[PDB]
Design a protein around this ligand. Structure first.
Ligand SMILES: Cc1ncc(Cn2c(C)c(CCOP(=O)(O)OP(=O)(O)O)sc2=O)c(N)n1
Ligand SMILES: Cc1ncc(Cn2c(C)c(CCOP(=O)(O)OP(=O)(O)O)sc2=O)c(N)n1
Ligand SMILES: Cc1ncc(Cn2c(C)c(CCOP(=O)(O)OP(=O)(O)O)sc2=O)c(N)n1
Ligand SMILES: Nc1ncnc2c1ncn2[C@@H]1O[C@H](COP(=O)(O)OP(=O)(O)O)[C@@H](O)[C@H]1O
Ligand SMILES: Nc1ncnc2c1ncn2[C@@H]1O[C@H](COP(=O)(O)OP(=O)(O)O)[C@@H](O)[C@H]1O
Ligand SMILES: Nc1ncnc2c1ncn2[C@@H]1O[C@H](COP(=O)(O)OP(=O)(O)O)[C@@H](O)[C@H]1O
Ligand SMILES: [Mg+2]
Ligand SMILES: [Mg+2]
Ligand SMILES: [Mg+2]
Lengths: 546, 546, 546
């Protein structure tokens, strides 16, 4: 007798799968879905462009271990969001893009429907799976397939097409209750066999110059104690990848990060934990590895990732928590790494660390700070306040921040990722604030910032505790490239604008820092105020390198 | 032996195909191509996001008749640009997307190369053709293929992949000069057969209530007088589609735009010229067409476009200039349309315009204008200053502007188009200014603006004569939607921001207009100044509709 | 300096991954690869059409557990092979399709190269992964990637594009030998967590009417005794799917195959082992399941396969051998299934078998046998000669054979599979004979046979011990459909041909069987002879159903 509709069944299916937040932009034909979602008591963050709603979704998935959800309209909105879905998939971040689509009959004949596109098809190369839910009765199963696909195996993006006709369909309330359900164990553990473990243990026990590489896959796994115990019990030196920073504290005694180049070229046994031997690792080839094939151990949940670049002497397939637990049990009681090895690296590290300290104390003209002395301030602040998310992107602004700013806690550093994407900054800030409930600090190149800058309005609209630091050097890499022809500005130039004024235009707080002292003062006040702020840090136009 | 590189051969090939402008964002691996393009005396507009450089290229193609060129980096940059390429293809705008790509060997084995992606195949569904130039000796033929594909037949987007190793290749100048060539007649005329024209002439002579529909395809054709000649000599009323406004002066005596519903519902014969019977026309059925199959004449360059929605009684395939010329000749001497038909429509138009006049005169509280009295100011300005491009996007801001602002010149109005895209705004402004060398006015909803607002900095960087008018009502459709839940802002709400301050943050001029008089004074000074300006028009948060 | 070419490095890489057999068709540009493969002492089976070489490779992968390899030429040859690759992926059979391709430069510009096609991207939707090997130094890693992708996780097809220029490349033997390697543990075990197993144990101990469903995934796993052990120790009745027949002797006391409808409709708990809840099982709903959601246990290596059709109460993800072992241990000591449940089913089976016995005994006119008395002969032969592969395809010829012919050994029955494909017949015969070195019998409908009949010549060319039994009823389903119009043959009709003569045309032995006794004598002599034979069984044109 009593009926319910597509809108409500979808809302119930999402809540059923523990989804309480969605990021997106409204309009035909999903505006009423967002309203009812809010009316129902769940939260919806509206952005100014779908790409950045999608970037927020992708990083929410990385932080929480459950698919971040992005909602968009058809055709052009879908396309904007699919670019972020592709980013999630290459980064192995669980994410679900939900998009409304037009009429099946008109689209299938290419007659020119409103926002016409076979979105399901277009999405295929950018996600793990692309589905379409045509019937109200299939909503629970549909959402279940999406969640399982996004979080199981190698996590990634999933596209779910929602035809406009779906929302208006009806079904008896009694019937709808038989259909709704909660999937059991959507992200199962996958334990490797003992002989696989035994093989890796032996390579490790017999290594002379061993090293452990931690990738963001390890950080994602959320088994920080297992990995920390492994590193300290074996006494092996470790190197963290960009987003693996903080898994163990960056200033940990066993960190060989400060002497990476040397540690890699000299090691004989390299243990890869949730890290791909891709471009970020020079593919295991080149002088960075002393022009020789190392004996690799690799732990990854994706079986065919093994031998993708170089032969892997000890492949260990399964989830990181299960595998590390077994590897520790196999190495229990074995002698720690050789002191001459671990000692020769620490020495190197101390040298570089002392040298870096040398640049951070250097003086500069007002409004002409360089990367070392400006970032040194952020470094000191983060060490004192590690429970804050650090968003970071750019070129000089990225590489230097990764070198200078120490992370003491895991899953706090959120950067450009595998594709070296410019544009994740602001979306990453909304998601980090929304899912952590703690402050966020974003170190942005001024070029990188431009890709998502309008979202400052979103940060202000939701009054998030985000402090955006713009490394304003006036351009890409450098801010002083000469005019190619008299009267024409170089393509790498950017207006050394008042981004602080832009922030205030939407209700935020803005600062302008010309020296390390002003930067520190502004940063401390900004973060403590709990208000959305922007610090326009003036960097020497020539301080950067290409 | 005098040698040359890939960079230069490509630059020469582009120049030979009459390209002298490129829109894009630099970085690995095409920064030097952009640099040398500039050194060579050609112009490159650097944007803050590739999607906008792409929208710029698409409209440049529309306005000029030659493909607009967008240049981007690999993977993520290319993806941002391809969203714009898809928009161009959908609207039939000539465009070429040039993107650098990575190493073939690494990408083909999916080993995790820098910015890895098979861009050539990812672009397939979004363009007319997707090519890749691997050898320096093939650059001349590749660019020629790209250009021809973009402008011939139904114009559209084309993707050209440029692997990094292409640029470094060398070849002797002698051989290079022997390969370089300019295609002959890239966009050839295609003349329809005599019977196709006679079939159309027949339907028109026997029409009791004929009407002409002009689409943007007609405007793109650039045969404004032939079309106007055909219209006047036949005495048949006409209706222009969104961007066809101005093909014939909007205030032309034969225009039935002010009574579209009655004209389309009561007509017996409808002549479509460069216009598709898609969603914009309710697919030629339903209440809007009186519920019966009219006898359609259609002139279009795409043969299989015929019978896509409704049976076409007189299909005329070929380029519009060639078709209209022959049709005009076939109708010379024939009796003009029925005066009792043309008279009834005229009376309807005069009636409705008088009705709109009363609205534009309405008085409103300061900071609370509605869409009639605010846009009435733009209307008057555009009637006095016809030679200005008008960019327009939004919902209420789009519909009301299309209805209120009369265009007196062709190809000046540039809006959301076929896909009703939000985000074309600022990109269109740059290209329009760039290719016309005249002033541009943009009427933007505040939500629409957010999709490309950061590019305001680009507009300032190039000191372009662009005036952006924000229809600030505070949200999507309306800015007063009540909190779905206490303390929770509705997903349709946007901050009623000081966009004027954002503009001034980059060196532009900002204004706030609370009344029609202030808007008028502001608009007149902004356009006259010839500098980058933004007018924050304060609209009643409850004036628009859903 | 001793050099080597692409041909040889590839040959070595294949041999290193334990491949010693290839199925294909030669021509430009891979004729010499096949030649040298043979010179090297490896075997190559040349077929009359690539599609059949591909089906051969797919079943070789199923039977052995290592990818079957198919070799083809460019464009059209590759397309014929990819249809088979799609079939392998759908059925989860490990397979690698190696195809030569043309010139990158010409194809990438779509200039009309010899056999032009971007084969790598055309194969995308039909396989787990599509790679291309452009450099000789990458052959070792490429083949390793292909093999791992094919056998790990859910087994499937993989495409490897080999551009013509690959083979001509040279490299020193020293370096070549330094690159060649054999992957470690390509198909790793994946063990499920303790709670996943306990959840399953729980449902089974509380079941009042349990049933086990064995799919071909279980058979492919090759852990026949573990499965049989779990079945006997639990006393739970089982039902095998098409190719799972023989995993446990079909005449095993606990089999409920002879009363499937009642077992599936009346069960309360259903344990799926390497079997999907797809169309073959009515998607776990409707009349066949009594119209209620049973409590499903599922063991599968593909995590996102769970909840694909119906909610899975106890999902157990991991490889079947590892899962069944742990489950068996978790159930040891538990009470066997309800005797009043197992007893009722048994009585149903004995009843129906007796009923089938009477049919097989039925007498028929010469040249007009039905499906029972003809297949009853095959049944008896297969019970006496269990170690023979049985290929089977058709409609009535498939359904009746599946029901009548009992299999006593595992992985012997090879049929149409998941897609109900006609045309697997003759290809399966070649591979089965090739990898088993034992006799093969094929029960083919006459229509099904036509899809691969020309390969009879291939079977004769290699003097393989294959006996093909044609169920000659004269058409699709039936061979007596009346002329739709006078003198016009019905589209379901086929000539009641002398297929025996076709076989003898290529040197094979042909027989015609008009009665069960003649079929019996013919079958016994054909198999015993060990030569290629075909038996033309004359079936009543009106015996089958629609
Ligand atoms: C979407 C996209 N577009 C373009 C690029 C190319 N690119 C761009 C545009 C960079 C910006 C460098 O400028 P910045 O202001 O961010 O930093 P520094 O000046 O501090 O180096 S770094 C880089 O690789 C990219 N990575 N992603
Ligand atoms: C890329 C994209 N995303 C979302 C939409 C949905 N949408 C959106 C977000 C509109 C904006 C309406 O708000 P506005 O401020 O632009 O105008 P008014 O308030 O004046 O109506 S109109 C519309 O169809 C779209 N067309 N394109
Ligand atoms: C490649 C392909 N084409 C067509 C079909 C359709 N089809 C066809 C053509 C069948 C043949 C039935 O005739 P038969 O002679 O093989 O068997 P019976 O007459 O003994 O039933 S069964 C069936 O589903 C198919 N399954 N696969
Ligand atoms: N829970 C998990 N257990 C094991 N491996 C995982 C898990 N989650 C993700 N992975 C793997 O982590 C790896 C991360 O690699 P990558 O993104 O390159 O990290 P990085 O850029 O820091 O080196 C991927 O191969 C992914 O399959
Ligand atoms: N030169 C030309 N001659 C004839 N037809 C053309 C020419 N250029 C473009 N066209 C056609 O113009 C049509 C434009 O349709 P559309 O974009 O729907 O316009 P609108 O939205 O204004 O109705 C397309 O079908 C395109 O094929
Ligand atoms: N070694 C394995 N361990 C667990 N599951 C496997 C293994 N190999 C294959 N599978 C699974 O076997 C299943 C077979 O399903 P299907 O082909 O539908 O069989 P059937 O048609 O006999 O029911 C697939 O879901 C596949 O993932
Ligand atoms: Mg910069
Ligand atoms: Mg608005
Ligand atoms: Mg038949």
């Amino acid at each position: 007798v009593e009926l319910t509709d597509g809108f409500h069944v979808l809302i119930d299916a999402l809540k059923m799968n523990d989804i309480d937040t969605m990021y997106g932009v409204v309009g035909i034909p999903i505006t009423n879905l967002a309203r009812m979602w809010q009316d129902d008591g769940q939260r919806f963050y509206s952005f100014r462009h779908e790409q950045h709603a999608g970037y927020a979704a992708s990083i929410a998935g990385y932080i929480e271990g459950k698919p971040g959800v992005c909602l968009t309209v058809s055709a052009p909105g879908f396309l904007n969001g699919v670019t972020s879905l592709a980013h999630a998939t290459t980064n192995c971040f669980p994410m679900i893009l939900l998009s409304g689509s037009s009429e099946r009959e008109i689209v299938d004949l290419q007659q020119g429907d409103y926002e016409e596109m076979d979105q399901m098809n277009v999405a295929r190369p950018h996600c793990k799976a692309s589905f379409r839910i045509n019937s109200i009765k299939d909503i629970p199963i549909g959402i279940a397939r999406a969640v399982r696909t996004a979080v199981s195996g190698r996590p990634g993006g999933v596209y779910v097409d929602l035809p406009a006709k779906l929302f208006g369909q009806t079904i008896s309330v009694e019937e709808a209750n038989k259909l709704l359900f909660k999937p059991i164990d959507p992200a199962p553990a996958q334990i490797p066999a003992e002989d696989a473990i035994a093989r890796a243990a032996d390579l490790i026990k017999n290594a002379k110059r061993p090293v452990i590489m931690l990738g963001k896959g390890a950080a994602y796994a959320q088994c920080d104690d297992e990995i920390r115990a492994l590193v300290e019990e074996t006494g092996i030196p470790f190197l963290p990848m960009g987003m693996a920073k903080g898994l163990l504290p960056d200033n940990h005694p066993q960190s060989a990060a400060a002497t990476r180049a040397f540690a890699l070229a000299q090691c004989d046994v390299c243990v890869l934990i949730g890290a791909r031997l891709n471009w970020l690792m020079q593919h295991g080839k080149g002088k960075t590895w002393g022009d020789e094939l190392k004996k690799y151990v690799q732990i990854d949940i994706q079986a065919n990732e093994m031998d993708s670049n170089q032969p892997i002497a000890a492949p260990v397939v399964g989830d990181i928590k299960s595998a590390v637990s077994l590897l520790r049990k196999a190495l229990k009681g074995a002698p720690k790494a050789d002191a001459e090895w671990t000692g020769a690296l620490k020495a190197k590290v101390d040298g570089n660390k002392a040298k870096l300290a040398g640049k951070m104390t250097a003086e500069t003209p007002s409004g002409m700070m360089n990367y070392s002395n400006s970032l040194g301030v952020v470094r000191d602040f983060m060490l004192a306040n590690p429970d804050i998310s650090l968003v970071n992107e750019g070129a000089n602004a990225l590489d230097n921040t990764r070198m200078i700013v120490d992370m003491l806690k895991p899953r706090k550093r959120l950067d450009s990722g595998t594709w070296g994407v410019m544009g994740i900054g602001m979306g990453y800030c909304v998601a980090a604030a929304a899912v952590t409930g703690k402050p966020v600090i974003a170190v942005e190149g001024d070029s990188a910032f431009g890709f998502s800058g309008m979202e400052l309005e979103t940060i202000c609209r939701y009054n998030l505790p985000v402090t955006v630091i713009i490394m304003n050097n006036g351009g890409i890499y450098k801010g002083n490239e000469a005019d190619p022809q008299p009267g024409v500005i170089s393509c790498t130039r950017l207006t050394r604008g008042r981004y602080d004024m832009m922030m205030e235009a939407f209700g935020g707080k803005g600062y302008v820092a010309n020296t390390p002292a002003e930067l520190k003062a502004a940063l401390e006040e900004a973060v403590a105020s709990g208000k959305p702020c922007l610090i326009n840090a003036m960097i020497d136009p020539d301080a950067g390198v290409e």
